Symmetry: C3
Subunit: 308 residues, 3 copies
């Protein structure tokens, strides 16, 4: 049987992503009804950098599937350094049934997935955050119903992991995705081209614009994220001035549909990419969105384990 991995959002076809999201809704209703890891079987959860959301959602989600998460800070273990990556993956494949890895370069994930004989999941990387976007899609479906044909606009740094994954995962769900970002901060060209091609299959579309007002108008869903990740703090750029016109504020939200909702991958810098009034107001779905990391990641793991 071919071993399935989930490193980027387009690793699932449109029909596959729909199966995962339906399973996420089922598991939210009945959270201990699927026990593929009963035993317990192990799952490795490896961090090159920590995250409250990633830690809590995976460790508890794996336990609720009957399994046992072994949670490792790769800084402490010096992964890749004390032995080859291939040697590590061969031994992991003997102790666990899946590998969940938060790491930086996408090439590292690809390397691990090409040698491991268990599913590899990208918990969060520099280029993609596909588990967050599964949770986002679950949240949108909860509140709006059918995903096909919705209009979603993302604002801020157009080349970070959330911009890339909202493009790929959004068009895989049939959502028309707009990225509003200033010049110099636009999506990676190969990611954009992949999203445009996948959008053809689903009847969705990809738009990239510097006009925040135009991106917000008529939108069903508005999304933003922090303007700067940790690796970019020393990149030499002013990472405030280019982004101020793209702030998700009350004025911008008033341009979207009356029933629009707001999403934000945590953490948030209130006053930069998003204001208190929007973050804490009635259109915000950020806390359900964070909860749904637990359910959507469980669904992904059930689905990958069962097909591998």
């Amino acid at each position: 049987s071919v071993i399935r991995h989930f490193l980027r959002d387009d690793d699932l076809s449109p029909a596959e992503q729909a199966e995962v999201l339906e399973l996420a809704a089922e598991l939210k209703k009945d959270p201990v009804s699927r026990r593929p890891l009963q035993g317990p079987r192990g799952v490795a959860v490896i961090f090159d950098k920590n995250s409250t959301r990633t830690r809590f959602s995976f460790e508890l989600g794996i336990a609720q599937l009957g399994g046992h998460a072994v949670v490792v800070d790769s800084g402490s273990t010096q992964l890749g350094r004390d032995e080859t990556l291939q040697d590590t993956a061969k031994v992991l494949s003997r102790y666990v049934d899946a590998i969940v890895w938060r790491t930086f370069g996408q090439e590292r994930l690809d390397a691990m997935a090409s040698v491991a004989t268990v599913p590899v999941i990208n918990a969060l990387s520099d280029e993609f955050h596909p588990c967050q976007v599964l949770a986002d899609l679950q949240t949108i479906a909860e509140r709006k119903g059918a995903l096909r044909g919705l209009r979603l606009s993302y604002f801020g740094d157009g080349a970070n992991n959330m911009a890339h994954s909202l493009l790929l995962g959004g068009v895989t769900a049939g959502i028309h995705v707009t990225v509003a970002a200033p010049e110099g901060f636009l999506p990676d060209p190969s990611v954009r081209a992949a999203a445009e091609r996948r959008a053809q299959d689903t009847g969705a579309s990809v738009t990239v614009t510097a006009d925040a007002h135009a991106a917000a108008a008529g939108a069903d869903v508005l999304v933003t994220d922090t303007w700067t990740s940790m690796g970019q703090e020393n990149d030499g750029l002013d990472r405030v001035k280019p982004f101020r016109p793209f702030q998700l504020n009350s004025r911008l939200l008033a341009l979207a549909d009356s029933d629009a909702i707001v999403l934000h991958c945590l953490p948030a810098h209130r006053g930069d990419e998003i204001t208190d009034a929007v973050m804490d107001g009635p259109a915000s779905a950020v806390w359900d969105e964070a909860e749904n990391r637990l359910h959507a990641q469980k669904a992904l793991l059930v689905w990958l384990l069962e097909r591998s």
Copy 2:
């Protein structure tokens, strides 16, 4: 309607009695209560590591059917853009309770006003209320009724054990004496809260520099590490112990620096209940969790 346990007086006298009864029932049947079956999650967060706090809470939560997500001090420095209100809101979607070892009471109070699940003070600078629940469980199983008993704490009277022994002690009806040198006395608002609670239970509060009179007729003698000249007269030694009531029991929340605040002869002797006391952290904290969860 969400109950928290940040200081000993957060429990009324009747409520503390319920928790201690539950601790005794759970010591006898440790897997008979499964409110976290699933597993449901509990966060166990350390701003500063505490190995013995981690053992008792992590195993206790598991024996309730749950799964402890244990976060050590290394991640205390939250990353860029992380807050406390937002952390509390997210934790409340993943876990059914939050156990937190932090420093200032201000931080505990802040988490508790935002979180929609119970918050437990695992250990703080001002109070150690889970240790005192275990201490009261230890006294009761060895001596029976706590009301009327006479307890004396020796040493640093300004630290978290002195404060919690005052508040939790008088909540149980114990006559509490702190014996401490001049610069190391209870915080005055804590002392006043304890004097107030004591009127409801028939207990009392005494603060003295006279170790001999604190030990004289004591039923329970407690000490704790000092951190050093001002504490030497309060050393819990063979000599003070002779002054107490017969069958008096000695407590010490660990670790002990043998030959500083307490002697080998007292700690290894037949008055010592220090090992049962340490075990009872497990039972008393499980009881507290069961009790908080069913009211929240």
Copy 3:
């Protein structure tokens, strides 16, 4: 009496055979034994971290129905804050067994002298007895009966793997050879203990600087890294003396044609072992690594029922 496992000879030949049989049974049926159901707790304490030791113990304890409380080295180190005796007395109230990776053997002996639960040496400076249980399980599943096999270890002859292959090997009736350069020889007390145990089992102990002689006709070839972190600053050139003892294709070709190769991992490819040997048909290093899980579960089951 409470049984501890601090060194390989803590098990008699008969008891070691019982543990290894249990490891084969647990490999077949990994969740059929639940002595820690509840869960009961097991302490897994690291004075220095070992990730593969963490994985195997943490999952193994869970599959016995228990809950491992894992303490990494980022906590205040045992012994500094209170006596080891005091710490052992508290641990004994919280858990049913203590698994500990520490440094000198006297710390293990101290903890076991007072603990009322079994103490297991996860890994120490002098011995690695759980790794050698996994090694023996691997050899037995690749070779059948252990008695009379010839095993040669190459490299630093005084590290924990050399000492444990000597002790655990002769306990199983294996003729053990340590091939090491002058000045890196087994501890004499350990060599004498292995020589005495070998009289009971028909085994033998050989120590030699002749790598070629040690490889010739061997059934099992073993090596390990030449240097631990603790040794990086010891002032020795820790490469030149060891290159004649590299486990490479030429050395392997001297052994029996059905010989297998073990390495407790991690490996430094190109130093103590070559890519060709470690990725070739004689290598059993991946089954070896997996068997840490099964052999340590067997040990825990066995110690818990005898204590």
